[PDB]
Amino acid sequence: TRYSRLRVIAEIRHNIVSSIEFDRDDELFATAGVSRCIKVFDFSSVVNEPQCPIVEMSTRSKLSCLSWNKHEKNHIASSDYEGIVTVWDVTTRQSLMEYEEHEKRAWSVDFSRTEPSMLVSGSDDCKVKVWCTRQEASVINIDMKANICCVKYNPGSSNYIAVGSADHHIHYYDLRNISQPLHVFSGHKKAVSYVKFLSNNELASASTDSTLRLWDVKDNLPVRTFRGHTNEKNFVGLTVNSEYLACGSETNEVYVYHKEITRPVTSHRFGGSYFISAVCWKSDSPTMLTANSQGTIKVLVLAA
C-alpha cells in the first residue's frame, strides 16, 4: 500500500550497461558495459542538473560487473569478457590489480563488506576465485561443474558466498571448507543469473525462468517465488535491500517486489525490443538507479 509507482527524478540519455553501482557512501555511482568504459558520476549532480561523468576509464574488454570497495572509497573492481578481474582507483584512473587466472569471461565480481581487501569472481570457466588485494595470486579456487553467473559475499561475514550457477542452483559455500557447499538451493528451472543478500540470513536470486526467489540461508529453506516480469534470455539486473527486490525485464520495464508479496508492488516502463540491463538500490531507501540496453540511465524513486 505504501508505494504504487516509480517516479523518474533524473535521466541520462545514451550500448548495454551491464552494471550500475553506488560507492561506499552512495555519493558516486559507476556504470560499465559493452562500450569498454567505466564511467563515474556524482549522484547529487545527476539529480540536480539539466550530464558528464567525472571519471572515464577505458578498458581492453567488455565489462560484465562492477563492485566498489567498501572501505577504500576510491577503489572499484570490474570483471570483463576476457576473464580479467581488475581493481581500479577512480582518482588516479590506474588499474591497481589485474587478476588474469580465469580462462573465460568472468560474469561477476564482489568486494566483501566485512573483509574489504577480499573480492570474489565467477566465470564461464566454471571456477570461483577469491582474491586479496595485497596478493597477486588467487587465495581460494573452487572448481565447479557449470558456468558461474554470479558470486556474492554474505554481508555479515566473509566466510560465506552464494554462487548462482548455470546448473539452475545456488551453491552456498563456507570458504573455510570448500569440499562441499554448506547447502545447494534448488528451485529455479533455468540458470541463476544473480544472487543478492537482503540481510545476513536472507538471500534472493534471479533466473531466466522469469522468477525471483527468496531463500533462508540460516535454516536452508525456500521462502518465496516472485513473478510478473519477463526474463527468459538476458542479464536484466537484480538489486535488493532490507525489504524490496527490484529487477529488470525483457519488456523494457523495471519491476519492484516487496519481499513478502509474490506479485509486483509496481513497475515502470522505461521508454523496441529493449531490456533493462542493470539496477541498484540506494541502500535501504526508495531511490534506485536503473539502466537499459540502449544505455539510458534513470534515477527512480518509489512513491505513493
Binding site: 548495454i16 558495459g33 559493452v34 567488455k62 548455470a166 542479464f235 540496453s293
Partner: peptide, 6 residues
C-alpha cells in the same frame, strides 16, 4: 551476443 545468460 552480449548480456546473454548461459
Amino acid at each position: 551476443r552480449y548480456a546473454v545468460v548461459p
